[PDB]
């Protein structure tokens, strides 16, 4: 095959993100268009930018092996969060100008390191929201495509529910009207490590009215198979009186040699087999780290399950340590859910939830906005979560699937603004922290001789500023701010009070007045994401198509 | 593949619009044209706007892509109602030049205001015709080609029936004249899970005086065989003395593996046969509140689980002694007892009490019309007419020709009725224009977005684009080089009948048209419309 | 594919109307050409106006779709009868130059009332010929392509048995010189409902020596399944006795409902089955109406079988009701043939014959030309007509088939002379149709006024005028009745005294002096169905290929 190389290269990756820009920027604003995508012998018509950037697709082999480096990494990649996906193809081709107008790898160490800066000011900006405020709602509103009804709905479940953190899910109903049931019942991040062990034999949903079970901390392999056969044994034989099936074996992971020696292990005693359920079940957790091991000590606390280190403690065990449970739990191969607990059980989990309480209580309020406590406040909200299942309805079967999607996105949306923070929206927040950074590296006196060589006197500092005036460009052209003169220029005082307009009223205000927000990860991680991939565009000079 | 980006893909939407308008509407008018479709080896030759629709295709991957925006909507999904496609068609290429006229979101939002004003109006507009009422012989005249016997017959047979609305059959009969056989009966949705329960064991029709229903609601498989093993047992054993055989299984869906089980439980007593019969008879039904009718018809309890049919009792299970006829498409209920009518009636109330307490917009909702659908299997009448005449030839079109005078009048009593001829809707938009506009409350407003604008008088050009297919090249434009409307005309509107060949009001003449039918298509135009106008991108791949 | 509208479509009919027009009328006249079709690997050279329509084929999908417009209906669906093809789309062409003459929707319904009444003035103008009527031998000799000795022959089959109307059959023979071979057997119009009753069980031809025949008027479906149940089993179990096997239930129509109860019930009594032949038979008729009531009833006389009209009257019956018959019957799947009839059933067949002949001679002329009339005679004809075999002999193989086809036409020819009429031929009917509606309108002074406005001062009447001299000239051009002048032109004297050729001799005269005559039926229908497929011809304006 061909071999493309210097300016040809160069060439067609300037072409290819010219194309992409273009039609994923046009479906942004009020003047927001529509593409029309083609799908076997049908037709879809949208208006979301991560479905038009998944579809795009080009004749040439050189074009499209440049396509899957633009848009492939936020769009097949990007499973867990779709939104903040025109965003991270937006700031691509405005970084990328920016490195191909400064060249030299002098310059571009000098880049890097100040929109790294500016990214230091996002993460502080960031606004931790509280469940109780009203804020919820305007982010509920914008995210359901301006919905009355849902974002009331959606905003009360959260609301109502103060101290615990309701997980949602979501069904195609019968009827034309919705219906909620809530259940008090908890989310666990365990899994099958084997699809034997399930109901049937071929990973299933088990059911259970009673367990077992026993956390172990190290990640097993072929070096523990000893360990337990010499642990299931004694546990089978001596202490098969206080013992209620099955005996559940939590982990951090399960090699393929210990989990068939388990179920030979399991084919030993068959006199305990009940209804094909086997006895004994291995789960895994995808944790990893020193961070990672306190979501097995909840795991733990939640079962009544002692904490072990070592796969042989399982041999020096007694009454004290082994408990047997006689609750309800519903095994997956994605995850387990817990429901029937006991009010016994429950004293024993709020006492150790306080415990985690009291250690964030005794920081200080810098690391407060960390990610230890962010992670303390993970460990909380599972456990002590609810479950709640929606079943949508409408008028057809279309507008149902529809109506579907339109709540995942709302919960998705208020689960983020909860979790990591809200910043004000409008292309607004982006523009406060680069004139931000700017002016606080030439105030600071210290640095301010260094800060003006590199940034100031270069025009790269200047160059920045136009940067990340582009989104609120794209949203607000065509109307009433950019009707006095040709182009609307910020100032000093705007970074104080903003001004936007709110395009389903016809106002003009503070985003903060207004009601206009966006979720913090998805802004941060798109100006991370964007200087990546922009600066590998601008450094290729080979294409190899053998 | 391709990626077609700006000036070119509002270039083709164009032109597939185009096409797409000046086969559909050349169907229309008296100088109406005939289309001539290939379908195989044969040639089919139709003036129905539905049927062009359906079949127009492009070579061009590009062009069928839009072709499948425009057409598709109101020609596949469109099931229920076959009629108010060509009307659908006609608005969308007129709303979809009103967009481009006035380009940009601010005018946009101002568009489907006004628009969304003028289908209130509709719905306020609309007769919605009574059982009694002497207007269905105006609609019966017109639909059965001017027949002076027919359109009589029928709508007596509505209006005589004052309380229920009558199903109709048809047969080809065997004599001169026309046979009619009324029956006090009723339809049901429920039929034969298996051919094997039926009369001869070979998917019959078992004529039944007597039984005892049970509705369960949960779709049946392989996992509720040992509950149904429990539940018929617990049946036949304890409750034998109150028991009318058959009993009657109604669910959901019966599958293969449940079926088989049912099979052998009816071998398990065979004390219980009588002349073949089998005791035992599993009924599917293709709507939750479907099986709630379906309940009170015959006595029957709701049932959630199978697993209930062990917790029974005398008070919740109820024997009839009336009379059934099973069936393999339907079964059709016929003897009613008067302590039975209480219940039908009583429980009818309720879902017209639901209708009463609802908004005007979701009156002409798809809730609403379902709601009707549960009332008129309630109260419904089965009426077998056998068409006869003079050859072979002359009953069998005589029998499509009361098919189509069914239609046209159940269509009238449960939709409604409005002055035809693209009347309604020039009557709705200068109705809408002179409210606004004289309402001196609004009235600063009103004339900035709208009067001021040129939208509302664009908007007055376009509902007279029907009136203008229908009756162009006759008498109503002969005077000048153009027919044009006034105050005057909105009082009493001016047509033409291109059977009879004279001009009046529509009222006098007796022109009329769906109401449901063309609301939906001003709903679904202006919906199409607005995509088409403001897609600017098209992907092949 | 592609879509077609506006001037093409119409530009592609146009063409293909006149493709098929020059093809098919060059076949007639004493100049008459030759059309050499090609079949495989062989060559079929022929003059039959039928078969060069069917088989005229197209390149094109546009011109194909038209093809199978103008030929197929009078080529396709007209396999009853087959001449009247050359006539059809002669008649298709001339028309469709009127509509497009004349356009718009008010001169369209104006044309077709006036072609409306041409059509009442022929069936007006038909001439009821009788048996004995030496005409029937020109008919036959035109028919016969001039043919001396089988023109004599068939003519003289029809005079000699003056009284019944013979059916002809014909088979390929052995011999040089014809075989006639005459049988006093009748054909019936019952045929199978399913094949499973049958000899072989697959729609065989079964003989019969012996049977008991029952009429029921009712159309049977899902209805009367136990009517029938209790019915047979009524008359197998108490009257057996006096019943000769098998059972013919005759009646209108048996639906697959029924058909499989009745299959059930031949299998409920294994004992009377004989040589595999089913004991019960049920039997449709193709009639419909309650004109076609009375032809059942001509079944119930012939085969000594009691009318019923309800299916459960089969219950109540009696020695008296109940005759079974030991004659000879054949039962097919086309059609039923009697043989054997006794010379006591022969009486009550005559008899009946003479009660339908009482009610015609106590009616009306005009009614005597009626549908009724003719239906009723039909009737007759039935109740008394004889079978006849010619086995057709030659020199050759190819010969004889030829000769077997030639022997046909004659039939096809003589039967519909007696039954439908005879018209002056040479297309001189139609001229006679035409100028004499115009002549009547116009004289009539009641109606002149309106007469005039629409169809004199228009030209339609003239141009109509026109359109019924384009036989007589493709007949008559090329020859001394064109030889005075460059165009015959007709008057009012030869509408009294019509004028013609005989092609044969080379004589002028009237076609009542020479001996020129079509079939009537032939004639009329050929200008029904010609008006029809130009009317759409002309007002098709879009071709859809998809």
Known sequence: TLLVHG???????????????????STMGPNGQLVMIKN???????????TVARSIRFADEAHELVNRVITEPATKTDEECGDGTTTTIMLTHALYHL?????????????????????????????????????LYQVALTSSNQDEKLARLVSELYANNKGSYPDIELKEGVNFEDQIEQTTGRTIRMFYANPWFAKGHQGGVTELTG?????????????????????????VKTHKQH??????????????????????????????????????IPLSTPVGGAIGTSELQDIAVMLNAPMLSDVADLTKLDTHSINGQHGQLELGGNRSILKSTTPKDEDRIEQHARGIEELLEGFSLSDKFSVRARYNERRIRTLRGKLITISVGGETYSEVK????????????????????????????????????????????????????????????????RLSTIQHKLLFKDTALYKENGSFHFNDDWLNTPTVMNLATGEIGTPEGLGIYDTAYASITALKGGLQTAKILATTKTLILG
């Open 7 to 25: 300016k040809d290269a160069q060439g067609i990756i300037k072409q290819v993100l010219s194309e992409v820009y273009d039609a994923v920027t």
């Open 40 to 50: 076997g012998v049908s037709t879809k018509t949208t208006k979301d930018g991560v």
């Open 99 to 135: 490195f191909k107008d400064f060249p030299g790898f002098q310059h571009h160490r000098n880049i890097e390191d100040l929109v790294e800066r500016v990214i230091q000011r996002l993460e502080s900006m960031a606004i931790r929201v509280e469940v109780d405020d009203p804020r």
């Open 211 to 235: 367990f077992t079970a026993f956390v172990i901390d190290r990640r097993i392999d072929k070096e523990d198979t000893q360990k337990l056969i010499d642990g299931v044994n004694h546990l």
């Open 243 to 280: 013992l209620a099936l099955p005996i559940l074996l939590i982990a951090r992971s399960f090699e393929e040699a210990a989990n068939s020696t388990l179920m030979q292990l399991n084919a030993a005693h068959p006199t305990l087999v009940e209804d094909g359920r086997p006895w004994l």
């Open 402 to 465: 529809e109506r579907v999607d339109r709540y995942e996105d709302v919960v998705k949306a208020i689960r983020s603004a909860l979790e990591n923070g809200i910043l004000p929206g409008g292309g607004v927040s982006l523009v406060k922290a680069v004139f931000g950074t700017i002016k606080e590296g030439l105030e600071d006196k210290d640095q301010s001789a260094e800060f003006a060589k590199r940034y100031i006197n270069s025009g790269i500092a200047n160059e920045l500023m």
